């Protein structure tokens, strides 16, 4: 591993070089109060602009999370089928995914993404 | 003289400075904020002063319906104020800021020409 993290390191060494030689053969400017605001399409920016956190996005990845740690459940399988006995690992397996496609279907009829908002 | 005619808003004087006073809080209560939100130099104390200075930009107003398009007129520049559809620059306007006071006593004006 430490073959890997040495060439990392030297990497985003090399990385930060670069991009402080740019910050250097990047010609200057006196600053402007204005060069420095946030880009609104020319037209000033409102109040904080702080987007609200009232929202789904934080649902979707939950769903992502679920279905994430899952995926860490099912992803020993490649290995094990080879020594686990067969019957356990068919069946065990098998399950696994077809809960999941009920879970699927079942919630499909239920729609949740189809929010009303 | 006298004319009988239709009404806009306000149907007596009172009336009228009914409206124009309520005109007169929002524009009193939005000041702070447009400090805040419309970075430009002015300050609230000044912004304030202005306010009053440009009420008594037409004390003498004497009709009715006059009275009450001065505050239709204000009732919208409020909102647009309120809301931030306007821009630093129109907001400032109210100063007129990029022209010195031009020569009033009559030898400026005459050595400065007409
Ligand atoms: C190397 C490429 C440099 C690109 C960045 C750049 O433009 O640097 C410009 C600077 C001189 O440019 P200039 O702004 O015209 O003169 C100094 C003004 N006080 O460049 C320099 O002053 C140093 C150049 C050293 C050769």
Same mark, same amino acid.
Not at chain 1, 7 to 31: E, N, P, Y
Not at chain 1, 83 to 112: A, D, K, P, V
Not at chain 2, 6 to 30: M, T
């Given at each position: 591993?430490?073959?890997?993290?040495?060439?990392?390191? =030297?990497?985003?060494?090399?990385?930060?070089?670069?991009?402080?030689?740019? %910050?250097?053969?990047?010609?200057?400017? =006196?600053?402007?109060?204005?060069?420095? %605001?946030?880009?609104?399409?020319?037209?000033?920016?409102? %109040?904080? %602009?702080?987007?609200?956190?009232?929202?789904?996005?934080?649902?979707?990845?939950?769903?992502?999370?679920?279905?994430?740690?899952?995926?860490?459940?099912?992803?020993?399988?490649?290995?094990?089928?080879?020594?686990?006995?067969? #019957?356990?690992?068919?069946?065990?397996?098998?399950?696994?995914?077809?809960?999941?496609?009920?879970?699927?279907?079942?919630?499909?009829?239920?729609? #949740?993404?189809?929010?009303?908002? | !003289?006298?004319?009988?005619?239709?009404?806009?808003?306000?149907?007596?004087?009172? +009336? !009228?400075?009914? &409206?124009?006073?309520?005109?007169?809080? !929002?524009?009193?209560?939005?000041?702070?904020?447009?400090? /805040?939100?419309?970075?430009?130099? /002015?300050?609230? +104390?000044?912004?304030?002063?202005?306010?009053? +200075?440009?009420?008594?930009?037409?004390?003498?107003?004497?009709?009715? &319906?006059?009275?009450? /398009?001065?505050? @239709?007129?204000?009732?919208?520049?409020? $909102?647009?104020?309120?809301?931030?559809?306007?821009?630093?620059?129109? @907001? /400032?306007?109210?100063? $007129?800021?990029?022209?010195?006071?031009?020569?009033?006593?009559?030898?400026?004006?005459?050595?400065?020409?007409?």
């Amino acid at each position: 591993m430490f073959s890997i993290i040495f060439i990392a390191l =030297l990497i985003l060494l090399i990385t930060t070089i670069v991009m402080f030689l740019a %910050s250097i053969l990047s010609k200057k400017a =006196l600053i402007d109060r204005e060069k420095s %605001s946030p880009f609104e399409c020319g037209f000033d920016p409102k %109040s904080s %602009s702080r987007l609200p956190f009232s929202l789904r996005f934080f649902l979707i990845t939950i769903i992502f999370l679920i279905f994430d740690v899952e995926i860490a459940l099912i992803l020993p399988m490649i290995i094990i089928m080879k020594y686990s006995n067969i #019957m356990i690992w068919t069946i065990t397996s098998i399950i696994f995914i077809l809960i999941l496609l009920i879970g699927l279907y079942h919630e499909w009829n239920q729609g #949740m993404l189809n929010w009303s908002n | !003289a006298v004319q009988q005619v239709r009404p806009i808003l306000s149907v007596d004087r009172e +009336e !009228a400075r009914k &409206r124009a006073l309520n005109l007169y809080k !929002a524009w009193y209560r939005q000041i702070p904020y447009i400090v /805040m939100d419309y970075d430009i130099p /002015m300050t609230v +104390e000044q912004c304030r002063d202005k306010l009053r +200075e440009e009420f008594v930009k037409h004390r003498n107003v004497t009709d009715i &319906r006059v009275i009450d /398009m001065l505050v @239709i007129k204000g009732q919208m520049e409020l $909102k647009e104020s309120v809301e931030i559809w306007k821009q630093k620059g129109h @907001i /400032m306007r109210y100063w $007129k800021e990029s022209q010195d006071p031009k020569p009033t006593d009559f030898l400026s004006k005459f050595i400065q020409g007409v």
